[PDB]
Amino acid sequence: PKVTDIANELKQAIDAKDEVQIAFIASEYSAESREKIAKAYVASYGKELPDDIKKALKGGSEESLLMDLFSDRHEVRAQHIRDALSGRNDHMAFFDTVILCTPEDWHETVAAYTRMFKKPLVEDFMKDVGRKEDWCLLMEKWMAHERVSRPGSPEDEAQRLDQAFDQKNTAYLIDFFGTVPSAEYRPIAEAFKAQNGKSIEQAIATIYTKTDYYTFYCAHFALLGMHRLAAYLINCACNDKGDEKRMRRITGMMVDKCLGAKHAYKIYGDMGTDIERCFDKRMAPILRTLWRVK
């Protein structure tokens, strides 16, 4: 279908105030494609698509999410990061915005942040986070998105990694998780598991607790695959009594890139069923539509 025709579908769904229908249309198209659609929409009707959505819907995280899907995902992410820093540091939001992110999207987000707030994002972040804990240090290095191929084979690398865990050489840990390329991480994690008593995940649990723990744990999933981190962060939202704010962050920014989440979710259960239980009558059908698990 032509973008003008999709824009018309959206017009009528908005007029109908049909939330699931807006979610369904959004779910059909990637972030880039939804940008094209939003362009056709404003040309056709002379109003911005997120502005029309906001005016048509009641509100709550449902409307915000739907708006986000037809907004600039880098401005969206940048504002989430601002929000996470505006009060007490929002560590959950940190995971959603900093760790569940491709380097490309991060780069554009940093540019959006300068445009929106006339401040350097990373500087603002480290200002409020500090460097007194290992999670802070990993996040700083993560944001650099400077991945560096590792010297040895997967088995040699897993052994050095294991030795680092066993000796609590946290400096090696921060540098490893902060700079290892994802493509290399997967074979390393497999070799680790195969040769050592613990898997990498169990090793993390042995040395870290609280925010350190969750930061390295998210990093682990991220390196395995963004859809696998997505699966985990959706399960967390379900378990945290239907965390609407997290679901809005990760769905609004990342749903198109993480649609494999439903398959990776099988280790926790049935994603569709879990969303059904944990989220209310309005939000749940929206999420299940977007994540393609009706």
UniProtKB/Swiss-Prot annotation:
Signal peptide annotation: none
GO cellular component terms listed in the entry, alphabetical order: cytoplasm; microtubule; plasma membrane
Assign the protein's first listed, main location to one coarse class: cytoplasm
**PROSITE patterns assigned:** ANNEXIN_2 (PS51897)
Cellular location(s): Cytoplasm, Cytoskeleton
Question: What keywords sit in the KW lines?
Answer: Annexin, Cytoplasm, Cytoskeleton, Microtubule, Repeat
Q: Which InterPro entries match?
A: Alpha_giardin, Annexin_repeat, Annexin_sf
Repeat positions for Annexin: 1-70, 72-142, 152-222, 225-292
One GO term (biological process): cytoskeleton organization
Q: Which GO terms describe its molecular function?
A: calcium ion binding; calcium-dependent phospholipid binding; phosphatidylserine binding
* Classification via Gene3D superfamilies: Annexin
Function, as annotated: Giardins are involved in parasite attachment to the intestinal mucosa and in the cytoskeletal disassembly and reassembly that marks the transition from infectious trophozoite to transmissible cyst. They may interact with other cytoskeletal proteins such as microtubules in the microribbons or crossbridges, to maintain the integrity of the ventral disk.
The Swiss-Prot or TrEMBL record describes its family as follows: Belongs to the annexin family. Giardin subunit alpha subfamily.
Provide the protein name.
Giardin subunit alpha-1
Species this protein is from: Giardia intestinalis (Giardia lamblia)
